[PDB]
Structure 1
């Protein structure tokens, strides 16, 4: 009935459940300041401070590229936990069957992750380790294949996404819409999910109209970004499969393995 109140509920749930938001990220990115990781020396320095356990194995430590990939996985795993609690604020989600809830999150989490990753990215690098590290885009590109191909497509998406100049009130509803997709494979009650999707997308459309009167096409632009994210995730899963088969040391967190299993 009152779509403005619903938009605010989602926004407040977004601020409460995600450790990073765009406002907090910009404060850090503008200038315990973040340690800058721009080469192997500064990577090893940062690890010894921020993730000492990971490099406390002496000569048995993993290769630098594998340690980085492992840190990315940890971030993903944490964002999954945050996304699962955020989903409860979406009208109708908690009323869905448990199996449908799992399915929606299975296919949505990485689309949501790459969307929200844009908030901690600029053209030179990205915030990591809960805002305490900044790793340069060029360093990540300098890694040996195939690890240098992980983040660059995400930077490419983020640069265009950030040019839309969304704020957290927009992003929170966008992430909600990502989760409420009625065309996910294997859904039980597609009808109820489609109605849930229609409701949240209705809220998103009205919010964008009020919050961005200067950009009349912003809503269709974001619909297209949702399609772009789906393709970005499919391509990411393909890369993860190559790493799994060709990099014996690059262990995949079990929760993420289940997410990728039978996805695409």
Structure 2
């Protein structure tokens, strides 16, 4: 009985995912591997190719809309911020497309997004990453990991840990239908500080995890220990976000000319 009900539940979460996210892992891997396309991403690996990309690639966020130019490393940070905020927007609409999330009081919705979106962002980020770099500008660009390493501290340091996480996460070979459930479980988390209706959120979280376990039995029948591996990745994401927030505090303290987006300020306020 419940195996069948949870299958339906999972399909509605997958549909929420397909409706709301700009890029799927399926599309991202087809770009990263070269698989079937008349166009290849422009590679950004140094200052000259960065300038050419700002001149010539199509950006969701127009360069003139970014804060005033300071230097190369900050400019990259500002592009990172733009994408982070765009993904918060997508995660919010994904969450709101899940009925049991929308049925929560709005203040609990905000609490879940506040403490869950970065975890979800760093999980979804793996979809566009390989060991050598990541996709940018809706897949029309590829920024090398080596170039990102060459940025000055603190900006290079806040980037590299996410690659380290992503390469290990991608070795589990999740597809979009697995990720939709994984991300929903990250957002619908009963552990978040200040939740008003903890039992309700705990119950939803449990349903999603049961759906995930069963989804993996069907979709990855040969993969041993995959469900417990993913619970551990959820734990790992919490630690990755703690470190990230600590690094952001140092950027706020020491990089005083760097602007932080007001929405992210609200997210870090009580972290």
TM-score band w.r.t. shorter chain: over 0.9
Unaligned ranges ≥5, structure 1: none
1:77 corresponds, among 77, 85, 109, to: 85
Instruction: Give the whole-Å Cα distance in 2 for the aligned partners of 1:56 and 1:111.
Output: 27
Please state if 1:161 is matched with 2:164.
Answer: no
**Aligned alpha-carbon RMSD (Å):** 1.7
Q: CA deviation at 1:220?
A: 0.5
How far apart are the structure 2 equivalents of 1:12 and 1:203? 15
Aligned residue pairs, count: 261
1:138 to 141, 146, 149: 146
Question: Any residues of structure 2 matched to 1:17-166 within 5 Å, and which?
Answer: 17-31=20-34, 32-50=39-57, 54=63, 61-166=69-174
TM-score normalized with structure 1 length: 0.95
- Do structure 1's residue 185 and structure 2's residue 190 form an aligned pair? no
Q: What secondary structure is seen at the aligned counterpart in 2 of 1:134?
A: strand
Q: Report how far residue 53 of structure 1 moved.
A: 5.1
Gaps of 5+ in 2: none
CA contact 1:115–1:229 (8 Å) conserved in 2: yes
Shift of 1:54: 3.0
> C-alpha distance in 2, partners of 1:28/1:216?
29
Normalising by structure 2, we get a TM-score of 0.92
Q: Given that residues 180 and 197 in structure 1 are in contact (C-alpha distance below 8 angstroms), is that contact kept between their aligned partners in structure 2?
A: yes
How far apart in 1 are the matches of 2:62 and 2:47? 18
